[model samples]
Target chain A: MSKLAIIAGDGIGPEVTAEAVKVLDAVVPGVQKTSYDLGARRFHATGEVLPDSVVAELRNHDAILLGAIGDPSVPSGVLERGLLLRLRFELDHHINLRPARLYPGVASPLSGNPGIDFVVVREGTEGPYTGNGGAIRVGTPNEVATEVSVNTAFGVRRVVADAFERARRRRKHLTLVHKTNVLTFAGGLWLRTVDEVGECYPDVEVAYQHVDAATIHMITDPGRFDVIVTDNLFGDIITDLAAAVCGGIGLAASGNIDATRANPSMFEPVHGSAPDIAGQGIADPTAAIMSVALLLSHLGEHDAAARVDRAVEAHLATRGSERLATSDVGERIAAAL
Target chain B: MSKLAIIAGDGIGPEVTAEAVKVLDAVVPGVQKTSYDLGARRFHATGEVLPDSVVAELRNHDAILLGAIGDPSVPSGVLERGLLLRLRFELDHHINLRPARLYPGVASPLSGNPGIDFVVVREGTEGPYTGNGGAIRVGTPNEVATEVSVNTAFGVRRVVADAFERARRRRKHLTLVHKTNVLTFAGGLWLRTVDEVGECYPDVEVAYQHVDAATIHMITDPGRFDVIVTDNLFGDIITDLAAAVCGGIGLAASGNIDATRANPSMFEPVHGSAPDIAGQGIADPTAAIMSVALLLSHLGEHDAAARVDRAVEAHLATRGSERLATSDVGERIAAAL
Candidate 1:
């Protein structure tokens, strides 16, 4: 009897999220879902991105499943900063998890069999994303702007420890990515923190790579990566690249996690709302279904998560070049489950 | 009559640099070449990286040509910070230019014919590379470290202006890569600078992509890019990936440039000094020769630069899987010229 807060946001968001719910219900039976109107439409209607009372209600859920959010009509950064980023901050979702896996029958833009299967554990709260920056003398010649990447022992250690656990469970290998040579102070702290936390998980192999080198490897040898732990900025850069190499963001699923479990984590597909294709029933819900797998795993439903992943993989393997309807794809995965 | 300061530094550096010199002399015969010994061997012998005398002498030259620098004997950051970074800061080398081109007969790790040809103009002086960060409570649970990405209107304008000029000359397309949505302040400064500077080069088409999206495009549709302007950190990451998608760093050439022409820009192959293969006569000098082309172009030898580039391209197109000796590769390109 777990409660799931579903923010089936703008456009194709509702379409994909419906399929995600179908699959979720197929596996877990009855999940108490509380729907929240929190995207473009709601913002236009009420002039509010997120109310405190709604946030309070969202906290009561065990986990969250979000569909894509954003619209052509809405201002660019409104829903992003107002809703998404705000949720991440308020929920203390420090561990941003993105798994890039090129399954069988998927077409990766990259040539050759890269065997790209890896999870990027991006630190969410701190680093450059913390907005510890200011611009002085705006619109002037002497204008100076600074974005400080703030890293704390508490923040880094928790993320690194979570990555170690993930690596331990998976391929038993983790690579900490940062610009250690250039960004000395921050890189040193990250390196030292990973070193200290890693001692406890001696079974997991540890390696280090500069963010530049990591990007190169992401293209040439994506298969070599198992679990990559990185700071907020590096994570944001690499995970998107990871999504590209492992096919496209269409099938990429992500999780904004509170590893502390003090608050409910949120899972969502990486793709945004395709405003043009809203009612066409043409949007692929595979990513949303994959988000369900991530949600299940986060709630400690490992077996159910694996089952969902396997079902999705099997569906993809046999499905040919013909495009399936959004609901058809979800139904097939649910039926397979 | 151009005076060129050459730092044919260590390992295979001297070996490959000789070929670069051969090509340089072929194109511009009357060029004055002053060789400087200033790497691992010099460091070990004199316990100095770049002495003030050498720095002064380097400043007197029109341009500098460097072969790779680094040896296993020297500590990691010693040569990088002391010599390379020291030269960059001392010379006011604000523009870090890397040209990624996949010529005929080259093997890119990518599958499809990406038609990869792009020049990444990375800001060298500012951003996270400035070392404006520190840590407190080292080796303790309360330890905190920060790295500040400092961007100024002065710095951003120069780099953006340089990029716009390059774009105007090339395909007339400039994509400014930065995470503006998340990194508001630094991103805002960069965006405003680009928008302002771009008004002068109205002929050049302007586009914007987040750093993460840029990495994705680097793999999927690399042919679309002509000139990419970015901050220090983003440039460092994408250039390496660009090198990979084009081919490998073995064919990558870079220039630490002073757009103001106040200081002599330094050109070198992005491939490192392969100590393992030093003196083997087997290291390819194509990248070094390419660096010579960059040096020639920087000195306003446009025809010579074009000739060098053509010669190198012709040489690479015909050269088979058979590996050529260091001198042989240089001589062949020179003969072709």
Candidate 2:
């Protein structure tokens, strides 16, 4: 049995995460659960983000579930860089996976009936997010700043191969989004890798688009995409667009994965910790439950994952204009499973 | 007395340019026009994209009206990099102006009554488009490729100031779109410049959004934006999103402006040369005619510009489901003017 670590971080993080755990327990009976106290409260008390000892402890688990992090009281980038980003970096979580699906009853921002169900595999570790940039003559008129997007064959190949595997499993269609014409150096590498890696999977179809063109298609013809793979910068932009077109991030779930499975992959809701609504029990747990489904999928429990997905879909269909309590939503989903 | 250099580029370039000129002539009688034959045909015939002498000649003009460029016969990025990019660089066209407005008769892809009218002021010269990166260990597993986004206080301040001035003229709302959290180096410079420069325009309501958040807003609440200023990459992404939400590239017009007026700015339709529909007289000339309005505005002929805009708006309202010919659309707008 694989161990599962739960970092139900702060505020509504614990509220929604409790419901997610309830559903997870229902699906996978007697699943190992270990809770880690991290984020704002811990930081305020101990003045430690992700201590080295806790990181070592987290590595013992096969997978992890993150509820949410950050608070208004905490200065920006403290919990983000220290706890969340530190965990990702330490775990070598390279692929940030996000699936944008327009469920039956959801209303999208797009006018016509847009069939949008796609997974965006965003590279997490490398690219511009690596903090591989700086400034000179700080805050002066003569100051010049540069952000270098670093891409290596080692990094890109794994993500490309992972995306291809995802495509083969789902729709057998993958689109590589980048500004090849303008950002030639990085784009060329990405393009060539897709071509080379794609040969191994003959059944899978591949397409290329400039990041700008992809955004246009995202709104106009969102149903066209199955799997989209891009660098960190473009991925961050498009994934949010994808979420919006598929009816906002309310039901959006994301997974930061170590595709190689050398380290535990962490799944979380796309929403942030609602500090004001922490103890109200009115927080939406659909996204958190969906995160559990992603976690199940990552653990190769496909049947269990499908059960969770179907339950969530059915629950979304039955949802009234009025909001449901966090526990009520969780109990409904768990009962459906 | 100002000279207007017209590069009636390949495919539908000449067809659309003729109609644009027709409208321009109607609005500003006896306007000086200099036609330049530069694009695929010139590349094939004389093996020249934009020669030094031709560039020197173009410099003398007060403004330039480009009609499309590119053909499938020529490889991609040939005319774009050599001819188009060359012109912008040589002329010091630092601000790429793109306006996305949901016209009266046009049906937007966005649902509901979305008030979609916004102008994007994209930094033309710097950021990732400067080709400031390279790769080592060519095509090998160890190959490392990089793309650098370069931002200077000098570059950012100028564009930020220009955007504020535009905001002051328009709805007095300027949104600075960038991924400040991740791409800290370049984003920092962009953010600081906007903050410092915005001090001059207190009336203009300045807002900041991560490039991702901006995309969501672009789809959800497009009407909220009046003017958006961003670095090259983010601008490229959002401008297309803005265009799609308003309608599409069909009616989009752009201006490559040297805000300082040291060099003659160029205005053109956002649509590319339709090699498939060239000489068929089926191309929509609304965008091309709109380019003339942008040109007139840049030359400080505000009254003439408004007349052209009103004429185009009126013409669009009168347009039926059936597509009109190149000359027919132009003639109607010109007559209205």
Candidate 3:
């Protein structure tokens, strides 16, 4: 039997994760699951975001499922980089997969468009998000801070290769989005790397667009894109934009992977622990349910994954716009299964 | 008399600027107006994007009314940086003002929303758009590139100061947008500078948001925002998104100003020349006409600007969705005046 580790993190994390677990249990039989406390709540209780003992417990699982990690009371970057980001980096989960697909029966903000169905494969472990740079005398009037956006040959080649491979599998069209026109140095490197990887897959079509123009195109005609691969900063902004196009952050799911390592991947919803909606059951659990689908699919349970997806779709089709609470949506999906 | 230099640049540029000129003639009589050619067609003929002679000629004018500047055959950034960007940089036009207000008959893509009405003040000269930094052995298999996003005390101070001043005069609320969590270096400088400027305007309420989150807020409830202030990159993306909310880019207009200089400011429609519809005459000129109104207003022709604005609004109210040509819409605005 395969084992699953659940990190029901801070804020409304436990509340939403509970519903996800219920749906998973109903669908996939004999899947042994265990829970680990590893976020702000645990920190509040034990004064540490992630204890060594918790890390030892996490290592026993075959796959990981995480809700969200963040607390407004604690400083922003400290807990994020220390725990969630640290696990990904330490585990070598380099590929960050954020898929943007619009749900049926949901009203999209795009004009003269059917819908956008695309995935953005972002390089997760490196780039600007690693917090490699620093500032001198911060909070002062004449403060100077530096953050470097780094793209290595190995990193770029591997990420672009993966994106092209996925594009060939999906739509055979991949667009490498960058700010080459303005950020000549970094963008130039990305453009060149795309060309290098693209030669191997001559059957797949490839294109490039400046980040600014890409954002505009995504807004105007989201249907034009199939699969997008971009840097960390651009990926962060565009994925969020894509999520808005799909539905909202509460309806988006993501996966973090390391292809070289046979170690299990981590799947989670692409939203923070919303402090304002912590106690309100109105927080949508669609993202969490979607994350479970991704987790099952990654583990080669395609049949079970499809069932979960169809059930979630049927639930949205029937009960969308009714303002269903997180548990209600989760329960609805489970009942459909 | 303050002179208005009309660079009725290219394609639909001439067509739209003609309408703006006619409106100016109808309202503000005896204002000196001269036309200059500086677009793709001229660049092809002379092999010069902007001749030194033209720059010298533009120096004499009090303000400039510019039309769109681009053709797909000719690279977009080449012409933009050589002429438009160069003019702004050389003339010290640090303040880039783009207003997004919905006109009554225009159909917007936003769902379940009334409309968006807000002005974005962007710092143009510096920020990420400068193409700063470099790449080593670029285009090679092992290419490495670095691009720096610089935010200075001088750049942030003036831009934030202008935003607060504009907010105090109009809405009494200013929203500062940045990605402080991710792009801490540049965003930190911007946030601190905004706080520094906030001290001067105690009556004006201040708000802040990460760039990605702000995009969601802008799309969901654009009505909540009054005035937005941001760096060049964020401004470029959000302004276009705002235009999409307003209806389309066809009705967007902007003014670039140099607060430290007494030279002429540059005003232009925030839409590119639609090469597909270039000689078709069906391109909208309302954005250009509105731009001229802003130019006149900036040059102290307040009554003339108001008259022009009212006439354009009246035209849009009556014939906005009729799919009229550039010249036809210009005539409609002229007749309304």
| Tens digits of lDDT, candidate 1, A1-337 | 2899999999899999999999999889878999988999899999889887778999999999999889988888999988999899899999999999999978888888667789999999999887888999989999999999888888889899999999999999999999898888879989998999988989999999999999989988899899999999999989999999888898899999999898899999999899999968999999999999999999999889988999999888887787899988987888789
Candidates 2 and 3: which is better by lDDT? 2
Task: List model 2 lDDT by residue over B1-337, tens digit each.
Answer: 2688998797888999999888888778887889998998889999999898988998888999998999988877889899998898898888999999999878788897577888999998888887889999868899999999888888888888999999999999999999888888898899999999988999999999988999999999898899999988888888888888878888899999998988889999988899899999999889998988999998998888999999999888878686789988988888788
State the lDDT at B226 in candidate 3: 84
**All models, DockQ values?**
0.88, 0.88, 0.49
Regions of candidate 2 where Cα sits further than 4 Å from its true position: none
Model 3 agreement with the true structure over A183-203: per-residue lDDT tens digits = 767776788889988899898
TM-score of chain A of each: 0.98, 0.98, 0.93
Relative to the real complex, the DockQ score for model 2 comes to 0.88
Q: How high is the lDDT of residue B227 in model 3?
A: 87
Q: Can you tell me the DockQ of model 3?
A: 0.49
Pick the winner on TM-score between candidates 2 and 3. 2
Per-residue CA lDDT of candidate 2, range A151-237, in tens?
Answer: 988888888999999999999999999998888888899999999999998999999999989999999999999999998878988
Model 1: per-residue lDDT, tens digit, B178-289? 9999899989999999999988988999999998888888888898899999999899998899889888889999999999999999999999999999989988999999
Model 3, B1-337: lDDT tens digits are: 8787888877788778888888889888888988887888888888788877888788788899998887877875878889888888777788888888888877767765466778898888877578766666666656666666666767777788888988998788899998887777777888888998899999889999778888877666788788899988788878888888887787899989876647788999988877777777877889999998888877878898888888888987888345687778888888877
Ranking by DockQ: 2, 1, 3
Best by lDDT: 1
Cα RMSD (angstroms) for every candidate in the order listed: 1.1, 1.1, 2.6
